[PDB]
Every structure is written in C-alpha cells, then in structure tokens.
C-alpha cells in the first residue's frame, strides 16, 4: 500500500519540494501536521537547508533529510565510487528503518534527474542495493529526462548513460519527463515565457499527485503499484513511459475547463502535449495508462478510449490487441490557488511507452559517444576510481536497448 | 564549502586588498565589525571566506605573501587592513628583487616554510576545505616567483582540493618589468602543473574596458583591481548562495576543461554599462548575452573570435526564468557555431543564481576557455626568445640560484601548451 | 619503428585456480596471434603480437622477445618492459620468477653478464607514490624531479648511482628496494650498460592493476595514470596506422610518462606483457587488463 519516495539530487530535492507540498495541501493538511512517507538526499547542504528553511519546514524531519556536506560535483563516478559510496549506508538504513515501520509497503518511488552528479550516481548504487534487499517490492522512478537541446551541463548525456545502464536491471518501471517540453506546453498551451524551476516542478507534481496519491485513494475503479508495470512493461527491462496531462489550460487567459471526456482524452494524443520530446514520429502504443481523477463517467471512459482505437492515426503494436489500462477515481484534480493552473473538476492522467523513446536514446546516446570519442572530461571520471570499461560496457548496453525498442515494435 | 585565499607578491596583495573590500560589501561586514549585512542570506556563507572565533569579529581567511614589507604595511594601514590577522601577516624582509628565481630558490625558499605552517593552520578549520585561492602577477619575485613554490607545494600536500588562481597577464603592448616575459614563462610553466583553475586577467585590457565600455577618465590601479574583485565574487562566492540552479568550483572547473593541461579562462562582464548615460536598464537577457560574449568585454587581450569556444561557463545571478536564459544561449551556440566547437553538443553551461551583486537587478559573469587564448600564450613565448636568445638579463637569474637548461624547460612546456590548443582548434 | 608489440601471458594451470572456481576454458587458446574468449557466456576475441602460456613457462617466454631485447640493449639501444596484472595473476612467477625457474629479470642479468675496459652497469629502481617518486637504491628511511636535457627526453634528479659488478647484486639490489615498498604502486628497474673504448637504458616497470574498490583518491590517482599511459599507446598505435597524426602524447599528464617519455620519444623498442589468470570468476579482472593493451 505505501510507497517511501526517495528524491535525490539538486532538481529531485526542488520537483520533491513541489510535489509534496500539493500532497500535503490537496489533503488538507497545513505545514505543520502528518509524517511525511519520503526521504531527500543530495550532495550539496545548501539544496537540503532550503527545506530546512522555506517552506513546509516543520512537515519533514531532519533524519528523512542527509546533508552530505563535503561535495557535489556534476559526475557520475564522483557521486557514486569515490563520495558516493559515503552516505550510502546512512541513506540505506534510513528507508529500511522507515519500510520497517509501514504497513506493508507496496515498493519505493524514486526521484531523480538523469543529468548531474548526486541524481545520477547515487540513485544507481541505491537502486541496486534497494533491489537486492526488497526485490519483492515495485521499483517505479520518476527520472527527469535532460532535454534534447537545452542542456544544462557539458556532461550531462555523460552522466545520463551511466545511469541509465546500472538502474536498468534494477527498475521496474522509470516515469521520464523531458524538462524542454514541459517550456514547450508552458508557451504553447500556458502561453507564459516566464518558467521558473517551481513551475517545471509544480506540473510534475500535478502528475505524480494523480500517480500515487490520488490513485492510492478510494475510487471507481482502483488501480495498485503492482498494476501498473504488469501492463505498463512487458518487458524485463526496465522501460520508461511517458507522463502526460489533460487540463494544461490556464486560469486566466483561456477560459474552457467545460471539455468532455473524449476532449481531454483527445488532448494526450498530441505532440503539443505530451510533456516529452519524444514526438510521435514512429512510436508505436505498446502499453498505455489512462488515469481518469474527478467527474468520470464509466461509459464515457470506455467510448473515449474505443473512438481513438479505431482512429487509426495512432498505431499500436502488432501484438498489443487491447493495451489500454483504464484507472477512474473519484476525487478531482487539486490545484494551487496561485498558480497558472486553471483547475478542471476532471483530469486525464496518460501513461503510455511507445517506441518513440528509441528516437530519444538514439540523441543522448549519440551526444555521449561523440563525446567520448574525444574522451572529453574522462579525466574526472577516472580520477574518481572509475574506468574506461564502465563507460564502454555502458555504451554497449544502451545500443542493446536502442536495438531492443526497435525489436519490440516496429516488426511485425 | 570553506576556501582559503592566499595573496603572492606586490600585485597580489593589491588585488586581494580591493578584492576583501568588495566581499566585504557583499557579506556586507564592517572593516572591524561584525554581520551589518542588509538582508540574512549572506550570514548562512560567511563560513565559506571568514572563520569563527571571537564572534563579532568575523576574520577573512587572507594569506598574505610578499617579500617587499612595505607592499603589505601599506595595506595593514588601510581601511580593510585591520581586518587581517597578525597570523596571516607572512612577509619576510629579504631581497623583494623582481625576480622568479630569487623569489622561488633563495629568498622565497626559505619564507614558504613559515608559509606552508600557516596554510595548514587555515585549512584545518572546519565543515570541509574545497580548494585555495591565489592571487599573482607573472611578473615579479614574490608574484611569479613564489606564487609558483606555494601552489607546487598546497597542491601536493592536498591534491584532492582544487585550485583556483587568477594570473596576471603582462600588458603585451606596454609591460612594466622588463624581465616580466622571463617570469611569466617561469610561472606559467608550474601553473599548468599544479593550478586547475586560472583566469587570466590583462594589464591593457582592464583600461580599455573601463575607457570605452565604462565612462572612466583615469583608470587608477585600485579602480583597475576593484573591477576585477569585483569579477571574481561572481564566480567563488556567488556559487556558494542559493539559486535556480546552484554551481560551485567542482561544477565549473570539471564542466570548463576538457582536457588535464590546465586550460586559461578568459573573464567578462556582461552588465558593464556607466553610472550616468549608460543608465538605459537594458539587462533584460539579450543584452547580457550580447555584452557578455563581446570581443572586448573579455578580460584579456586576447579575442576569442580568432579562436575556437571550447567551453564557457556562464554564471548569472538574479530572479529570472530558465527558459529566457537557456534558450538565449542556445541562440548564441547556433549564431557563432563557426568558432563554438563542433565535437561537444553544448559548449555552454548555464547556472542561474538568485543573488546580485547588491545594488543591481540582473547580472551575470562570464568565464569562457578558448582556444584563442594561445595568441596570450604566443606573444610571451615570442618576447622571451626574443630577450633569452640574447640573454639580456639571464645573469639576474644566475646570480641567485637558476639552471640555464631551466630557462628552456618553462620555454619548451608553454610553447606545447599552445600546440595542444591549436591542435583542437582547427 | 615498430609498434607497441604487447604479448599476452596466461598463467600457468595453478591448483588454486581450479580450486577456486570452474576455470574450465574460459580463455581459449586458437594459434598464438589470437585468442579466443568463452567467460562463463561472454564472447570476445583477444588480438596480440603473441600469446604464451599456460603450457609456456617463463623460460620460453623469456627466450623468445626478452633474449634478443637484451642483445639489443647491450648494442646501446633502449628498450622499456610493462608489466601489467591484478591479484594473484600470476605476475611475481612471470617478472621475478621462482627460486628454481628464474623469471625474465634473474635471466635477463645471466645474459647482460654474459656479454661481459669500458664496461659500466648502472642500475636504478624508484618507486611512485602519488605523484612522488622515491629512489629505492637502498633506503629505508627517508623531492625528485625530472628535469629536461637539450636533448628533449627528462631525466630522474637525484637518482642514487651503484654499479652492478656481479649478478648477485643486481638481484640484491631489487630484493632491498621491494622491501622499502610503499596492491599499491609502480616500480621501476633500469639496468644502464655503458659500454666504452655509449647509453642504453633497459627499465622494468611493475604496474599496478587498477581498481574500483574503496591518502587521498590514491585508486582514482594511479587509475589516471593508467589510463594516461594507454592513451599515450593509443596515440602511436593509430599514429603508425596512418601516414601521419597530430600524436599528442600525454607525457606531461602523470609523472611516470615524463620517464616513459625519454624512451617513447627516443628510438627504442616496447614491449607491453600483461599477465592474467584463465578462470571463469576472474574475467572482470582480465577484462579490464586486456582493455589496458587494448583491441585491434
Ligand atoms: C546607483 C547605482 O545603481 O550605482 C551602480 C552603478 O552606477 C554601476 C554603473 C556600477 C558601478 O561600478 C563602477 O563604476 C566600477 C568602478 C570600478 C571597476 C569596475 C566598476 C558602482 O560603482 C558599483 C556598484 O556595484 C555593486 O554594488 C555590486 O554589488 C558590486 N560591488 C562592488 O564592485 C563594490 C564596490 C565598492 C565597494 C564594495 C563592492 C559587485 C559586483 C559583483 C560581485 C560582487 C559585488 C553599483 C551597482 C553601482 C556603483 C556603486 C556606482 C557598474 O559596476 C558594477 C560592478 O556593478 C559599472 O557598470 C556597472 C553598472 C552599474 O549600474
Ligand atoms: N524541470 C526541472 N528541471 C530541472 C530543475 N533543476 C534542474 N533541472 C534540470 O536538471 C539538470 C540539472 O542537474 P543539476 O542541477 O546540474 O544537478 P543535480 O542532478 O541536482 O546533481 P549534481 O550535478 O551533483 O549537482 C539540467 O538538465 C536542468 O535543466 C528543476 O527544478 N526543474
Ligand atoms: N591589475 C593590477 N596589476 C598590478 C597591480 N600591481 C602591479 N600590477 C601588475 O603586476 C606586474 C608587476 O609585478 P609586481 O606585482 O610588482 O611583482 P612583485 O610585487 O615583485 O611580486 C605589472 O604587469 C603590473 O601592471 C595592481 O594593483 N593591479
Ligand atoms: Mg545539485
């Protein structure tokens, strides 16, 4: 049943600060309640005094909260071999000792960045060892994609490789959200050209509200932890699907939250709203989540669903006959009051993989192999206890995966 | 994240004096007071720069190094030179000669002793030691000269901490020493083998700046280095303060050098506009942009449109949206992709903090390695040939303590360090 | 000139191996040019200048590169050897050897004798510990530099100078040094034969193999200087491929290339030996010793 989220890194520390603070403000609970069910940890105390500091202070405790007070850095090797390896144990005994005290914990949900150093590094030694001791349980990350052309650091596809070759036997299921395409619907639906962190964060947290909290709730029909990866990945390897929303419209320019249920629905089939760069150039559906929260009608669910089957425009995988998995709740979706949000009594929540992320793998694995080819900042790494071989195994390992993707649809 | 600054020679403690007169400023603490600092941010990293003690008195941790005692009397008599404890007084009344050898083997031998126990002594403070800070002129005894001793030794004994010196660049067009490229080339030679980080700041270049850019008539040398102080506080300290997104010297140096040959950073500023007329207010994000990456905001003589932009670091601070920011830069990699480097996807790393300099709205610092910088490099190399061929003033090395191979050694190591950068340049 | 020949050794079928686990054939051995990789199932092929073992003892290894090398340094040439392996692969039998079967350095010695007016043997080994190098011609108890001739190669500064009269003394000479010691280090042995009426240096170097295991950064700093000395193999090897290449050698990046540099940019033959185990469990550490040498 509950789910201890681990946020790890500068941007998991921010998107963890936006995320629970709806938690916590959509349940009615003021700063100063209940016991948070998650854990923050990064390189830099500075991120971690923020939240000491700002806002909802009182609402964590400072063991749910490691200060690693000697470095950061922007590398992988950096935040997993040489500091890495410091607090490891402290942060490990800190969620086993929180499993401990649940009620029968449905599994852990992670929260991180591809890029940087802390949320690259530490989350892949942390979900190795997580699913050495509670590989019974569900592994569901939400790792920020770096985006395809707006990086924020020189190895950032350096990093994101790494990362994404240790945790991939080690995840069951990695929520990707591309931080370009959240600008993009802000411009493009929000019409706002002033996107400050929080906001990035705050659309996150607006999904994740409606991943776990919302869908832990009591519904119509209620849909587990467990549910999701047995339809979501197919596949042993830990595949990422997409995060998309429906009510993206804002609460001041456009006024038109009265949209119908094959609207909204209609609304998480578009590029334009995807929260992904991932555009739909060949991404056949494989496995697609429709969480409905608010004011949903059964059969109007069922009518969205079946009017964009036969559509046809959007491919399926040949041998994916029905991968539509339907989740109605009651509650609506919550919005912060001082926000762009324009606040819809229903709300689509559209998670859905397809083979489109092979066109995103094939740019970051690119950036980093021509990187590599002039060994760039290799030198960082190596210093760190890291050799060329986990580089190279990792190149490997992704190319498998860019062959994999392309083996799963595409072919009939 | 404390860091520790050490200032070599005349020049080093005149910049470091201006240097602890802008932080200051920007802690906001009195000469011999305590935190009047105006908001409360800057009281949660004053660990960073100053140590605990007495409480009230919050002392900057400043070496000061210098082989000539007037240079630091004068700046002990100042209005920032009480602030300095006694233990951080380093001098040593011997020969102050302007020269490398005489600062490196005789006379500053024998002073980096007392040195090494002093550094020790900052470094053993508290939280966790990041790296040093060293400011120095090539060319000088105690500048060049001992500059180059102290980094060899404070990087061997924690090689695990970085380094970050700003090196003072002979003005190509008039220098001041005559055996100025003699020491440059000597204090260049350890700089590649012992810094990772260093800035390069020009002598001509800082007037021109502050007379086309800037509405300044007399460019004194205290104006000179305040601008400079002024520079560096964006780059060490801004990086310690909350933000968007939160860098630091890690952050910067291991997303700067591409390569282990140490790699020179050539600084700008973008809002560089006069107090009177220059007053339009046009720092929006463009205009940063356009101002930062301009051939002559650049700190140095050398332009790096002759060259190629390996990697830039750009630093801003204050409230503006990732979205303004990143695109613009994006702008910029796309525009000028004729000299940005085609082997790295993004040469360009953003970090946006959300403080300014006080009493400014938007700002942002520009650190930028470029391969044109070996033009700086080819210049010395060309003056000290010129002078070595002939040995005009070789004697003066001689005569306390130098080899003639080791004359050749400094020669031979920056001629290949310009090699390697035209290398990747074309 | 040649290319960075670089042999592979495999050790000698050793109980403990099998004990410790299925070596079964794990390195397989088809012709002595190539090797062929089934790691319990891991498929890789292993291309080298030549093979030995594990039937090869060290005698035969020693006799067919190591013979001539020393014939060739005694005519004045330089000549460098690596040596290169990780835990228990076997190195100490392939370098110093056995008491009863002498390794590549108490034969090499039989044979710089044997060639035995103008005859001095001048034999130096020092050892790097972060960065500093430490003269072990002698010494128990305790700055080097290398400084640059006109020349362009460096040279080791205030390096202890014995002249080797007897073979018994070079073998004293390095049982002395290996006791002041610093899995931790690389020590290097050169053996000078001056011969007068003329300088060869022939230098022995123990590397260390690499880790990713938990002094300051002491793995992360000896792996750096691992992988500069590859890079710097890498440079010349595709150097030679092509007619021509910017070849930046990275000499200046780790103290030990400066010394290596003296040899590598002069004229002298490389021979690169790294020795590893053919168990199964142990392909991780061969793994990484073979991408040390690297693939064709
Ligand atoms: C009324 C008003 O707004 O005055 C401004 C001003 O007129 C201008 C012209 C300032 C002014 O700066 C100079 O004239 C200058 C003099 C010598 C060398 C370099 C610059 C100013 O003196 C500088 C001063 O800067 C700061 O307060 C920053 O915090 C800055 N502080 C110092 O350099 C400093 C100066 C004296 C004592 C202690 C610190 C800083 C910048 C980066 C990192 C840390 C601190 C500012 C905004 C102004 C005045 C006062 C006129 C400008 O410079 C800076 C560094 O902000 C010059 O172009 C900019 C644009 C500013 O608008
Ligand atoms: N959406 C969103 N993206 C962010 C946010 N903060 C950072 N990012 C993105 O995530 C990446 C930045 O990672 P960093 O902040 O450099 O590093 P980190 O992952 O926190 O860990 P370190 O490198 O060790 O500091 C860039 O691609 C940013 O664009 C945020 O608040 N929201
Ligand atoms: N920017 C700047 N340069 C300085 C200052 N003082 C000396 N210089 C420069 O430093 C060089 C002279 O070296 P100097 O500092 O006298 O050497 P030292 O005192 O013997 O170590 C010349 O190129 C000067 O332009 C200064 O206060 N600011
Ligand atoms: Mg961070």
């Known amino acids: 049943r509950e789910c201890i989220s681990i946020h790890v890194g500068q941007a998991g520390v921010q998107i963890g600060n936006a995320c629970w603070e709806l938690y916590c403000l959509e349940h009615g609970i003021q700063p100063d309640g209940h016991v948070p069910r998650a854990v923050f940890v990064d390189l830099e105390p500075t991120v971690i005094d923020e939240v000491r500091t700002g806002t909802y202070r009182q609402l964590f405790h400072p063991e749910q909260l490691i200060t690693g007070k000697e470095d950061a850095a922007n590398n992988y090797a950096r935040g997993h071999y040489t500091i890495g390896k410091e607090i490891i144990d402290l942060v490990l005994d800190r969620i086993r000792k929180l499993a401990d005290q649940c009620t029968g914990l449905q599994g852990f949900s992670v929260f991180h960045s591809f890029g940087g150093g802390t949320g690259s590094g530490f989350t892949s030694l942390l979900m190795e060892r997580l699913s050495v001791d509670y590989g019974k349980k569900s592994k569901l990350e939400f790792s920020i994609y770096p985006a395809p052309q707006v990086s924020t650091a020189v190895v950032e596809p350096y990093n994101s490789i790494l990362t994404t070759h240790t945790t991939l036997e080690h995840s069951d299921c990695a929520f990707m959200v591309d931080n370009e395409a959240i600008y993009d619907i802000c411009r493009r639906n929000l019409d706002i050209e002033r996107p400050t962190y929080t906001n990035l964060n705050r659309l996150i947290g607006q999904i994740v509200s409606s991943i776990t909290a919302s869908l832990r709730f009591?519904?119509?029909?209620?849909?587990?932890?467990?549910?999701?990866?047995?339809?979501?990945?197919?596949?042993?390897?830990?595949?990422?699907?997409?995060?998309?929303?429906?009510?993206?419209?804002?609460?001041?320019?456009?006024?038109?939250?009265?949209?119908?249920?094959?609207?909204?629905?209609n609304a998480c089939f578009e590029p334009a709203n995807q929260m992904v760069k991932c555009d739909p150039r060949h991404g056949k559906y494989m496995a697609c989540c429709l969480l409905y929260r608010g004011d949903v009608v059964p059969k109007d669910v069922n009518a969205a669903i079946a009017t964009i089957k036969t559509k046809r425009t959007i491919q399926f995988v040949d041998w994916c006959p029905t991968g539509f998995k339907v989740g109605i709740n009651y509650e609506p979706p919550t919005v912060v009051p001082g926000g762009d949000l324009a606040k819809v009594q229903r709300a689509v929540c559209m998670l859905s993989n397809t083979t489109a992320i092979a066109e995103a793998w094939a740019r970051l694995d690119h950036k980093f192999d021509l990187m590599y080819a002039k060994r760039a900042f290799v030198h960082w790494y190596v210093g760190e206890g890291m050799e060329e071989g986990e580089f190279s195994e990792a190149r490997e390992d992704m190319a498998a995966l860019e062959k994999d993707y392309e083996e799963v649809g595409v072919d009939s | 994240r404390e860091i520790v600054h050490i200032q070599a020679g005349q020049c080093g403690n005149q910049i470091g004096a201006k240097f602890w007169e802008v932080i200051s400023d920007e802690h906001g603490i009195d000469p011999t007071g305590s935190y009047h600092g105006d908001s409360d941010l800057q009281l949660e990293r004053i660990n960073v720069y100053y140590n605990e003690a007495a409480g009230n008195k919050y002392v900057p941790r400043a070496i000061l190094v210098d082989l000539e005692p007037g240079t630091m009397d004068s700046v002990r008599s100042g209005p920032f030179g009480q602030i300095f404890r006694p233990d951080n007084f380093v001098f040593g009344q011997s020969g102050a000669g302007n020269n490398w050898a005489k600062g490196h083997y005789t006379e500053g031998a024998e002073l980096v002793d007392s040195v090494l126990d002093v550094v020790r002594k900052e470094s053993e403070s508290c939280d966790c030691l990041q790296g040093f800070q060293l400011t120095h002129s090539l060319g000088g005894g105690t500048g060049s000269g001992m500059g180059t001793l102290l980094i060899s030794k404070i990087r061997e004994e924690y090689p695990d901490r970085i380094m970050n010196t700003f090196s003072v660049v002979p003005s190509p067009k008039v220098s001041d020493t005559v055996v100025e490229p003699y020491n440059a080339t000597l204090s260049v030679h350890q700089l590649v083998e012992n810094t990772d980080e260093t800035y390069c700041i020009d002598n001509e270049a800082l007037y021109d700046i502050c007379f086309r850019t800037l509405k300044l008539t007399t460019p004194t040398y205290g104006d000179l280095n305040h601008l400079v102080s002024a520079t560096m506080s964006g780059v060490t300290t801004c990086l310690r303060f909350p933000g968007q997104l939160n860098a630091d010297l890690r952050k910067l140096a291991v997303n700067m050098v591409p390569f282990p040959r140490l790699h020179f950073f050539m600084p700008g500023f973008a809002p560089l506009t006069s107090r009177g007329s220059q007053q339009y207010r046009a720092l929006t994000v463009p205009e940063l942009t356009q101002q930062m990456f301009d051939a002559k905001n650049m700190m140095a003589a050398c332009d790096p449109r002759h060259g190629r932009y390996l990697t830039v670091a750009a630093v801003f601070r204050?409230?503006?949206?990732?979205?303004?920011?990143?695109?613009?830069?994006?702008?910029?990699?796309?525009?000028?992709?004729?000299?940005?480097?085609?082997?790295?996807?993004?040469?360009?790393?953003?970090?946006?903090?959300?403080?300014?300099?006080?009493?400014?709205?938007?700002?942002?610092?520009?650190?930028?390695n470029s391969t044109a910088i070996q033009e700086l490099f080819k210049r010395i190399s060309e003056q000290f040939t010129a002078m070595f061929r002939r040995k005009a003033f070789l004697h003066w090395y001689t005569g306390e303590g130098m080899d003639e191979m080791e004359f050749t050694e400094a020669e031979s190591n920056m001629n290949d360090l310009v090699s390697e950068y035209q290398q990747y340049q074309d | 000139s040649e290319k960075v020949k670089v042999y592979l050794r495999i050790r000698p079928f050793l109980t403990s191996e099998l004990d410790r686990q299925e070596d079964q054939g794990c390195v397989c051995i088809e012709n002595t040019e190539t090797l062929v990789l089934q790691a319990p199932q891991a498929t890789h092929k292993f291309?080298?200048?030549?093979?030995?073992?594990?039937?090869?003892?060290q005698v035969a290894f020693f006799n067919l590169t190591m013979k001539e090398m020393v014939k060739?340094?005694?005519?004045?040439?330089?000549?460098?050897?690596?040596?290169?392996?990780?835990?228990?692969?076997?190195?100490?039998?392939?370098?110093?050897?056995?008491?009863?079967?002498?390794?590549?350095?108490?034969?090499?010695?039989?044979?710089?004798?044997?060639?035995?007016?103008?005859?001095?043997?001048?034999?130096?080994?020092?050892?790097?510990?972060?960065?500093?190098?430490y003269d072990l011609l002698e010494?128990?108890?305790?700055?080097?530099?290398?400084?640059?001739?006109?020349?362009?190669?460096?040279?080791?500064?205030?390096?202890?100078?014995?002249?080797?009269?007897?073979?018994?003394?070079?073998?004293?000479?390095?049982?002395?040094?290996?006791?002041?010691?610093?899995?931790?280090?690389?020590?290097?042995?050169?053996?000078?034969?001056?011969?007068?009426?003329?300088?060869?240096?022939?230098?022995?170097?123990?590397?260390?193999?690499?880790?990713?295991?938990?002094?300051?950064?002491?793995?992360?700093?000896?792996?750096?200087?691992?992988?500069?000395?590859?890079?710097?193999?890498?440079?010349?090897?595709?150097?030679?491929?092509?007619?021509?290449?910017?070849?930046?050698?990275?000499?200046?990046?780790?103290?030990?290339?400066?010394?290596?540099?003296?040899?590598?940019?002069?004229?002298?033959?490389?021979?690169?030996?790294?020795?590893?185990?053919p168990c199964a469990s142990t392909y991780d550490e061969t793994l990484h010793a073979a991408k040390f040498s690297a693939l064709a």
């Open chain 2, 318 to 368: 204050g409230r503006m949206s990732m979205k303004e920011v990143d695109e613009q830069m994006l702008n910029v990699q796309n525009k000028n992709s004729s000299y940005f480097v085609e082997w790295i996807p993004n040469n360009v790393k953003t970090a946006v903090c959300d403080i300014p300099p006080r009493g400014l709205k938007m700002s942002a610092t520009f650190i930028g």
């Open chain 3, 47 to 57: 291309t080298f200048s030549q093979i030995f073992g594990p039937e090869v003892g």
């Open chain 3, 139 to 277: 010494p128990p108890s305790h700055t080097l530099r290398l400084c640059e001739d006109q020349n362009g190669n460096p040279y080791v500064k205030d390096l202890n100078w014995i002249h080797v009269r007897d073979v018994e003394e070079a073998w004293k000479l390095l049982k002395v040094g290996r006791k002041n010691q610093s899995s931790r280090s690389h020590s290097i042995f050169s053996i000078r034969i001056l011969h007068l009426q003329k300088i060869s240096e022939l230098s022995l170097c123990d590397l260390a193999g690499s880790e990713r295991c938990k002094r300051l950064k002491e793995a992360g700093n000896i792996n750096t200087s691992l992988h500069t000395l590859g890079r710097c193999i890498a440079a010349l090897r595709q150097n030679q491929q092509n007619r021509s290449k910017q070849n930046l050698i990275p000499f200046r990046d780790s103290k030990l290339t400066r010394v290596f540099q003296g040899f590598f940019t002069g004229r002298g033959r490389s021979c690169m030996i790294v020795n590893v185990n």
């Open chain 3, 72 to 133: 060739d340094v005694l005519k004045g040439q330089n000549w460098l050897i690596y040596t290169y392996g990780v835990t228990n692969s076997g190195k100490t039998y392939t370098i110093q050897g056995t008491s009863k079967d002498a390794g590549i350095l108490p034969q090499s010695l039989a044979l710089i004798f044997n060639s035995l007016i103008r005859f001095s043997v001048w034999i130096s080994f020092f050892e790097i510990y972060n960065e500093l190098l």
């Open chain 1, 218 to 265: 009591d519904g119509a029909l209620n849909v587990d932890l467990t549910e999701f990866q047995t339809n979501l990945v197919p596949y042993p390897r830990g595949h990422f699907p997409l995060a998309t929303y429906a009510p993206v419209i804002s609460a001041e320019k456009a006024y038109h939250e009265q949209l119908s249920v094959a609207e909204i629905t």
